[PDB]
Amino acid sequence: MMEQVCDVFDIYAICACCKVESKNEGKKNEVFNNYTFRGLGNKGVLPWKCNSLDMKYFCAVTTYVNESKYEKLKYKRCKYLKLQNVVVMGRTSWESIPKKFKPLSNRINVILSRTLKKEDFDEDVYIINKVEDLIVLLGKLNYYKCFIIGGSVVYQEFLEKKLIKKIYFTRINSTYECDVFFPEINENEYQIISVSDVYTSNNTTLDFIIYKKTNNDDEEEDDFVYFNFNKEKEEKNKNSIHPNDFQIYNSLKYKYHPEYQYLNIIYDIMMNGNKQSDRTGVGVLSKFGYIMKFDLSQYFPLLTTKKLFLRGIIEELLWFIRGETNGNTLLNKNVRIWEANGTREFLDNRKLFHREVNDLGPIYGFQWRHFGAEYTNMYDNYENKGVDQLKNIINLIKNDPTSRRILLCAWNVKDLDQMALPPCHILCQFYVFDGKLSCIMYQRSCDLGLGVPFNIASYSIFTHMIAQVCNLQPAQFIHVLGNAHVYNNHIDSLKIQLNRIPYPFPTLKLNPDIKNIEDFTISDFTIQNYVHHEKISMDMAA
Amino acid sequence: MMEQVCDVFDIYAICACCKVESKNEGKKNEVFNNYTFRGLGNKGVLPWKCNSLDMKYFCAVTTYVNESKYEKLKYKRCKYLNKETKKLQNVVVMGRTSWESIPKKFKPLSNRINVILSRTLKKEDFDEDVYIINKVEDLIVLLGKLNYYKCFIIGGSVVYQEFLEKKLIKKIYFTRINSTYECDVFFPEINENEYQIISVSDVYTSNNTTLDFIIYKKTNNDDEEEDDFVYFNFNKEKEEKNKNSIHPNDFQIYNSLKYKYHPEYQYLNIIYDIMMNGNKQSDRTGVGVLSKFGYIMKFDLSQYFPLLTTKKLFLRGIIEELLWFIRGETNGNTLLNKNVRIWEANGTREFLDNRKLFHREVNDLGPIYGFQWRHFGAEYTNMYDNYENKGVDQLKNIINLIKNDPTSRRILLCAWNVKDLDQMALPPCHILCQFYVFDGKLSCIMYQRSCDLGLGVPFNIASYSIFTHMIAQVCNLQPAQFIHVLGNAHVYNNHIDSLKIQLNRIPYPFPTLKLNPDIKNIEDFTISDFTIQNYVHHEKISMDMAA
């Protein structure tokens, strides 16, 4: 006994909005939200011109029909009063459509206009006079679903009339000039229930999310239940971790966005992690073994559910490449990532009494460029001492790309004790095929709340660097987690974070001129179109 | 289209079978097939007496009902009889002896309609709420009168015999108890032409025996969010780059399966993934391989020893190798004198010279595994030198951390000594091991840089599973998960036909591994301290059909 039209006639909306350039601030924005993506059109045309991928989506969604499911619909459409779908649109829009493709192939075409006269058009192409008019027309017709493909004005009113069931919203992650925008969706009316994978098309990233109106053969089916007869009736920390804490996170239907690979792990550890001791005093929840994969050819996996800064980690990466072990080099650039591990107190607890403060010992950088060399102090000359692994893996990539020995290992067993701290990131393995570079990095200890996000970005950038100086395109960054833990003092922050819906990922642009791994400088890196949620202090006590 | 009794009334059979105590005439090498599992009962009772997990499964299957589907089922059955316009239960049918084998406190089976076949007894002879029938046909008449979800034939042999004989069974829920017991009753030999295995469950351990659940099938002769799934998969290319070299009909059995939950499928699926999507690359002297990058397999060592069953595997070799590793040895002669040739090819004059190790004695493998495990950092001289207290004894170290600082996130064993690589006859394929300890249980992750799925991987999995057991035992812990990480995973083309065959074999429940409980030091193990039990396996497959 549903008294709602949009729900009976299956009236959906579908669009694609890009970011709009604020004459006040410019491209680099200070705050974001769903209303960030609102650019609809410009000069009677699309802000971008052609988005080969979004186009394929538009078509696929509006031309898709499931005939074996139709009767159920008609049964109720007639009760309330070659199958195809219905595509409503405003005059202006219908006009911006190129002749050869108009009217839309395999669609029901209906133009909501008051100047257009039935005659001018053929029986096929319909023409309505107003909102209410449509509804009736849908009665005297046979269709699967009805899609409002624009324009702005049509969207605007239809949202007021509350005649929209769902909104297929495409987020174009780039800025363009616009003159017409999509209505600010009221989060009390419509809410995101699905977010797709992230892609790159026409030199820009984009994704697809779904807005849903807030309501406020068989033999093998039982065999599935049988095989589950021994499944857990409950979760370890299910109690300690409440449910109304993740209603949004758990309200989503399809979470294909890559960021969920990180978020889902957070969830698993909060719901099933093992409670353990920790020298730091506080406790943690830990699990053993996880995998995340990012397609660097489609996006740069910099988290968006919170804010992340990259200057620090890029400088750290350049510091590694130079083979330095001098913490002062980072402190003088205000990169305090290693400061705690280079203090008098920290070095002494490691029993390195004869080590100068900030002399981190034979860590990463030294192992990458001098594995095997005898470590004296951070100021010594190590030219041509030890094994230059970095150089070697680059030559392997260039001259023997099919090798299965392209590894960069920082876990020098003989030098662990001499290190301020043993490496968390154990090694890197590279793989090359059809001019593409993928990288696997094994991490023995992973702090999901604070370190992992930076760890992801760090190696993604590194894969980009190695690829460029080898004339390859980055492909996959595979992150293998050993001990994965969440600090108890981060649980509250992570709960907030798991309920934030990801924005399409940004992209990484490297100065194309740099051709040798050793020539990169801080200015040679640029993160573009990074749309993100607000900063979150994992440690809320400060 | 006519209707078939078994389908209209949904008549299923559920059983449990073990391995019989049949004679072996002294032939160590026993042959295996499904008929291997056929022990129903003995002396009026179960061959094994009791098995919690299987019984829990039996109760789960025979009492589960989905009242939603009945509406549809009432339609069918009614339309079949030509008739058409309170808690739904299943029907269990059983023979006289089966009924008498049930313990009084469990009679009649709870939440189920109990039907008993008999001639020597009538309703007057029963106190319980049950139905008696003196002939099969009566069951059909009765089913037509009752309101039930599904009908299950739960034995005994005589009963299974007639129901399969009369072609009344739609599917068979078969439990394979992987152990041997004295028996005097057997389940009928299932005809491969009538029934085909369509699902294989995960493997488990219960009452000192592993077991799995398989389903045989009778062979021939919010809904809107569903549309959204279609949309999001709009960018899918329904193509596979190697389907042309690997035809569909070559994986009939493999693809026919519905549920592939047996742990062995983690291996098989990777193989299948590489054959259908691998990358074509070169090798040593034009040899071809298909490869992918980055895989992961997980094995619950508390429930089974993951020794592949779709082909025969011997472990004497990889065990000796492991003890050789633990002893820190680099002398290939030691293995050869035990008729273990795993390292033979890598220690020849020709091989060593090709590696530029001109001054290395034949079979002196150099600073490999063993050495790095007990002396990482020490200068390698020759396989006969004494390296006592030289280099870092990683093995000893990781054992102390597991014992005294179990929460440490530094318990790693690494054989990839960047400085010694060139001095090694061959660089290590198994780069490292990380251990994890929680609640008295030990888990292990092993990263392998290069993986030969056809030959190597099967042995690699067994090697590290055994090592996890050994380490867990000398540390007073219980083995848990062996997690295998694959970097460069490849399949040699010379192996494709052999693997296509293997992919079409159904896995048997895994065996178990037994270690002499007295060995408490990682260094005190000997070949006679390792025992594999109940290894049911397919025929050995020679990967290379050109030898």
Ligand SMILES: NC(=O)C1=CN([C@@H]2O[C@H](COP(=O)(O)OP(=O)(O)OC[C@H]3O[C@@H](n4cnc5c(N)ncnc54)[C@H](OP(=O)(O)O)[C@@H]3O)[C@@H](O)[C@H]2O)C=CC1
């Ligand atoms: N990214 C996206 O998803 C979309 C982008 N666009 C872009 O935006 C631009 C067009 O949008 P827009 O300016 O809003 O124009 P519209 O396409 O929405 O058409 C508006 C016109 O349609 C008729 N109309 C609308 N509502 C009613 C009503 N209630 N009753 C009677 N007639 C009505 C009237 O035409 P009249 O009375 O004169 O006959 C009106 O002037 C183009 O540049 C196009 O490329 C358009 C749709 C979607």
Ligand SMILES: NC(=O)C1=CN([C@@H]2O[C@H](COP(=O)(O)OP(=O)(O)OC[C@H]3O[C@@H](n4cnc5c(N)ncnc54)[C@H](OP(=O)(O)O)[C@@H]3O)[C@@H](O)[C@H]2O)C=CC1
């Ligand atoms: N592992 C497993 O899954 C199972 C094991 N078992 C075991 O097997 C043994 C019992 O099997 P089994 O010896 O074959 O005995 P059954 O359970 O099959 O019972 C056979 C008897 O039931 C009656 N019966 C069977 N068919 C008919 C028919 N068509 N018409 C009339 N009466 C019929 C007759 O008894 P009557 O003399 O009264 O006329 C007959 O002698 C026990 O050891 C038990 O523990 C049993 C079921 C399953």
Ligand SMILES: CC1(C)N=C(N)N=C(N)N1c1ccc(Cl)cc1
């Ligand atoms: C192709 C495009 C931009 N993309 C989406 N996701 N939704 C629409 N309604 N579109 C659209 C189609 C036709 C016209 Cl005239 C205007 C916009």
Ligand SMILES: CC1(C)N=C(N)N=C(N)N1c1ccc(Cl)cc1
């Ligand atoms: C418990 C057991 C062995 N287990 C399974 N999977 N199938 C049966 N039919 N069983 C069974 C049920 C009732 C009786 Cl009387 C005998 C055996």
